[PDB]
Amino acid sequence: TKVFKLSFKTPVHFGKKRLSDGEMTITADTLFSALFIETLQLGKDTDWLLNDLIISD
RNA sequence: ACGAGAACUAGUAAUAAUUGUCAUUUGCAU
User: Fold this and answer.
1) Which DSSP category does A27 fall into?
2) Sign of the alpha-carbon torsion through A16, A20, A24, A29
3) What is chain A's percent helix, strand, coil content, to nearest 5?
4) From the CA of A47, how many Å to the C1' of B20?
5) Signal peptide location in the record (predicted)?
């Protein structure tokens, strides 16, 4: 049960409704979506990291 | 399988214009 720390050094747009909107934190929805899209881009197998991983916001 | 994805705060125009470094004052009393 490890935790990850994120440093950016470049400004980030995270969005709620419109591109001119700004939000500070994002939810496990967008995070899990990103992990899924990068898993598919890598061409790895998705079953393992679909129904076993629990992510906090 | 991220309220996403496309998207040059870009294009036009300058320090310009009229102004003199002048106006008087013995290389002079042996």
Assistant:
1) -
2) positive
3) 25, 0, 75
4) 93
5) none
